[PDB]
């Protein structure tokens, strides 16, 4: 027997966790009062092992030790060129071993210890299970987990395995697009649609056509960014204070890491905020050498610092279109995926792509994925 | 416990029954393989009680012994002036007992039975509880049943009566605009919007004006006709092809009730047809005095046939619109309920008042009632 099965979108960036429950999707928060956790990790120098928000919140001088877009790695050999290109942006140390890109840290006291991409990716699932454990009050055995729909065989086994090393069961994986239409019903309808996901992550872009016919999807193309993401759009703004205290004090904040992370994380709440107000304020208390930040953002100025970020998600979407063999009218629903997809300026850009097209609406962009993984695990559940 | 709670459009006219099964609501089709029942009761002269399909298709050898339209007298006493007007209409006997308007019928052999409104819509839930049961494979005892908005307390008790009566306790009483605007999924939208309900049943046309405030529904204002609907179309046909027939043959139709009968059958086949095709056929076998049938029906035919009838639907829609002191551009959603909506012509009607707006879609309009009645029924399953 299954129990509760659970829906997990594991994320580059962050992850989230769906159970169907007393009839609908209810998407579960985690302690820290997030429906959406960091897919992140990080060892403190006790040797406690922190996992999502106070792995990615936790304060410190050696990024080398926090580990994070495993998923860029999962299902690759050490020698894939992707694999060889990413390493070089990573901060933490990446090492070939059993012809894998094993992730090397020091887990507390000089103790050095090293992991497959998918032994981290089973920590997020570990914190994702617990998540969904407190939630319902007993314990979970098996999950229905999402990939990208480029995920080839060895990224769709290796994540299977991250669930098995999780105490995980990994029914069914099933593609990241398909479960967001899902989530919006898009199987429920007559005939053949033509349904364009456009899902701006945390960290990548990925854009997929999909056709449904009487009840079947099928994936047809795909493209996108793989380094294009909402994190991207909180460097932008991150270079602009930096360079306007530069300009100001004649300070380099970059010589404090912890004042970095600090103006990261309060950088990230402003553009959250800009998406529904037109102006921000980012206060840091004794920000660099007890010095005070105080300084504030318009919607214009964020949508300036990232306009070309921007208006660069519209070329994949072209490129879809042609490798489908289809134009712009031929598109029956446009589905958002990712909180990403929240920002004004991106959503007036793909309506404007469409012809003033209206997108699906109603289910929050960076739930979805999961959300269709929880109607499958619904199913299971029986 | 609950079990598997079932979904019923007790109609006046005709019945539908949804369940919450594997994720989503079913249609279920009864043992004639119809997803819609007839609402009507017959007796054999054997004395078989026939219900729904059987009970409508029996050659008449009881005009007097078939019931139908017992939603009219339901809840209602005997002295009521809609019963008094209704019962001059109505071909059966009904006969005041314990104040209410009984029906009194031969069930077989002489035998007269009397039954109370609530008994006969009870057989009529009875045939709907069975249609399930076959489906589900197991008993059902609980139910969430619809009504029109403007039942009063006594109609909607007398409704309960029915349910008890059939075995099923009636958990919930949902008034039918509301259930179609949930199978809609309107109860799912932010902010406040106007509902306009535009439902067009066999024997009835009920226009209702809705208000959804953060997923609470208000009965604003109701209006119609009492009178009016998809039967009315049929006797129009009906009474075109007697008077054709007249003309060709010289003979008199109505001489013959079996004739009447198997033209009434073909006639309802055909305006279906209609909504989909510009023509369709109608054929009969020994139709009168051994003579065979064969005309046609254009879709234009129909529409001159029926235009007085088609455009009086406007009326009410205007009025509901006045009572709630609305304009037409205050309408935030139209749903459109009924099989009759399905008439090219009345939606063409329905999207010019509204100066192009397009209804909602994608659930059989005669179906939307039980599809939202099974949509409540499913979160109370659990
Ligand atoms: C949490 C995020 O910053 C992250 O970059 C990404 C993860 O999918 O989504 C963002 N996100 C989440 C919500 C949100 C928003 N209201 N406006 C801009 N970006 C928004
Ligand atoms: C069965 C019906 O005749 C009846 O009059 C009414 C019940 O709601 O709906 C009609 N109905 C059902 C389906 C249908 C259609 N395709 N075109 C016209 N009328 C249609």
Redesign the interface.
């Known amino acids: 027997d299954v129990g509760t099965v659970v829906g997990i979108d594991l994320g580059t960036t962050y992850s989230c966790v769906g159970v ?1 429950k ?3 999707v209810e998407i579960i928060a985690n302690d820290q009062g997030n429906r959406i956790t960091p897919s992140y990790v990080a060892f403190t120098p006790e040797g406690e092992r922190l996992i999502g928000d106070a792995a990615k919140n936790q304060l410190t001088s050696n990024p080398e030790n926090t580990v994070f877009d495993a998923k860029r790695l999962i299902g690759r050999t050490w020698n894939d060129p992707s694999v060889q290109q990413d390493i070089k942006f990573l901060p933490f140390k990446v090492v070939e071993k059993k012809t894998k890109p094993y992730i090397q840290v020091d887990i507390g006291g000089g103790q050095t210890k090293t992991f497959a991409p998918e032994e981290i990716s089973a920590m997020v699932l570990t914190k994702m299970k617990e998540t969904a454990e407190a939630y319902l009050g007993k314990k979970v055995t098996h999950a229905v987990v999402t990939v990208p729909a480029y995920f080839n065989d060895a990224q769709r086994q290796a994540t299977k395995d991250a669930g098995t090393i999780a105490g995980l069961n990994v029914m069914r994986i099933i593609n990241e697009p398909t479960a967001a239409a899902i989530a919006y ?1 898009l199987d ?3 005939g053949e649609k033509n349904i364009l996901v456009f899902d701006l992550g945390g960290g990548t872009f990925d854009v997929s056509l999909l056709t449904i016919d009487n009840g079947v999807f099928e994936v047809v193309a795909t493209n996108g960014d793989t380094h294009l993401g909402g994190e991207d759009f909180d460097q932008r703004v991150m270079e602009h204070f930096i360079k306007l205290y530069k300009k100001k004090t004649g300070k380099d904040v970059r010589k404090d890491n912890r004042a970095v992370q600090k103006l990261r994380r309060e950088v990230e709440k402003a553009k959250r905020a800009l998406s529904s107000q037109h102006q921000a304020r980012i206060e840091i208390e004794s920000f660099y050498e007890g010095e005070d930040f105080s300084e504030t953002l318009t919607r214009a100025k964020f949508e300036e610092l990232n306009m070309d970020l921007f208006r660069s998600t519209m070329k994949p979407v072209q490129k879809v279109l042609e490798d489908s063999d289809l134009k712009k009218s031929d598109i029956d629903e446009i589905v958002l995926v990712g909180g990403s997809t929240r920002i004004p300026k991106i959503q007036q850009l793909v309506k404007e792509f469409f012809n003033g097209k209206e997108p699906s609406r ?1 289910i929050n962009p960076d739930e979805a994925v999961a959300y269709g993984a929880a ?1 499958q695990a ?2 299971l559940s029986g």
Do not use: S
């Open positions: 169907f007393n009839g609908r019903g429920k309808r007559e109603g109607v619904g199913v």
